[PDB]
Design a binder for this molecule. Structure first.
Ligand SMILES: COC(=O)C[C@@H](NC(=O)[C@@H](NC(=O)[C@@H](/N=C1/NCC(=O)N2CC[C@@H](C)[C@H]2C(=O)N[C@@H](C(C)C)C(=O)N[C@H]1C(C)(C)C)C(C)(C)C)[C@@H](C)c1ccccc1)c1nccs1
Length: 253
């Protein structure tokens, strides 16, 4: 792997790795309490042996610049972070894959960037969501304080998350956990749109998801394809991420 840095629209440095390959260029977008190490740890990366893989750390996570404000964590800023990565590698065609909120990011990048030929959203749908201000602020307080990593660890353990997902939370600065959480009140509630007719949009979730309605809504509204994995919940579906990688590799082939 090679490392890269790019600068987002607002000056934030965005750092990542490039794993060269002869195949399609795939850009990987992690979730809120994660960093780019999840792709190797989950087995997703080994499922794409031929692809040119680009994996960034979103702002405030991993090796990328610190933010520390809620508006700095607005959805539009993460979209700018990903588009900067698309600029550095100069391709006309990219396939994006995002986990959890990273899926929402990938969908929004697809809406605005005609270089995105495919976008895959793992365990996130594309529809409008009502965000309860009070509960999100409460969660920001929990995650940003001294007990914040333990709060997330305990929650994800108790819901059967894979170990890599449990462990990743402790690698995120508590101040950025709080700011990213508050950032969800700045634009993340809106639905995403289709960027252009030829785009391939894929949503992935647990067959046991308690709320499949918005996933079906995306099939209808966006012409998205819905992929199911065997799991009772979205968190547990993350145990199937390597398997999903193999299915992505079948599309890219
Ligand atoms: C139903 O969702 C689940 O089954 C768990 C699942 N979450 C999500 O799919 C989505 N979100 C949510 O549904 C709600 N949102 C929350 N908090 C905002 C939020 O998400 N976070 C703040 C901390 C950060 C780790 C992240 C998170 O995970 N928090 C958990 C908490 C229980 C540990 C958490 O969901 N809390 C809740 C409350 C309200 C209880 C505080 C909502 C409807 C208000 C948007 C994410 C992907 C998203 C955010 C914005 C736009 C669209 C989607 C995940 N499992 C692992 C990673 S994401």
């Amino acid at each position: 792997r090679d490392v890269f840095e790019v600068f987002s629209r607002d000056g934030t440095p965005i750092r990542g790795f490039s794993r060269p390959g002869p195949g399609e260029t795939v850009v990987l977008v992690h979730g809120v309490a994660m960093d780019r190490r999840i792709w190797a740890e989950s087995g997703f990366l080994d499922a794409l042996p031929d692809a040119h893989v680009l994996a960034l750390d979103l702002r405030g996570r991993g090796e990328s610049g610190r933010v520390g404000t809620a508006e700095g964590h607005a959805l539009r800023r993460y979209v700018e972070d990903v588009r900067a990565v698309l600029d550095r590698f100069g391709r006309a065609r990219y396939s994006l894959f995002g986990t959890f909120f990273g899926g929402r990011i990938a969908l929004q990048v697809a809406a605005v960037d005609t270089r995105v030929a495919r976008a895959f959203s793992f365990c996130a749908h594309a529809e409008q969501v009502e965000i309860p201000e009070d509960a999100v602020e409460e969660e920001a307080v929990a995650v940003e304080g001294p007990g914040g990593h333990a709060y997330l660890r305990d929650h994800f353990t108790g819901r059967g998350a894979p170990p890599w997902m449990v462990e990743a939370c402790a690698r995120v600065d508590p101040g950025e956990l709080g700011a990213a959480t508050r950032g969800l009140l700045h634009g993340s509630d809106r639905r995403t749109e289709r960027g252009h007719p030829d785009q391939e949009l894929v949503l992935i979730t647990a067959d046991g998801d308690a709320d499949l309605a918005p996933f079906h809504a995306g099939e209808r509204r966006l012409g998205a394809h819905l992929w199911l994995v065997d799991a009772p919940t979205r968190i547990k579906a993350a145990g199937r991420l390597a398997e999903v990688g193999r299915r992505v590799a079948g599309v890219l082939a």
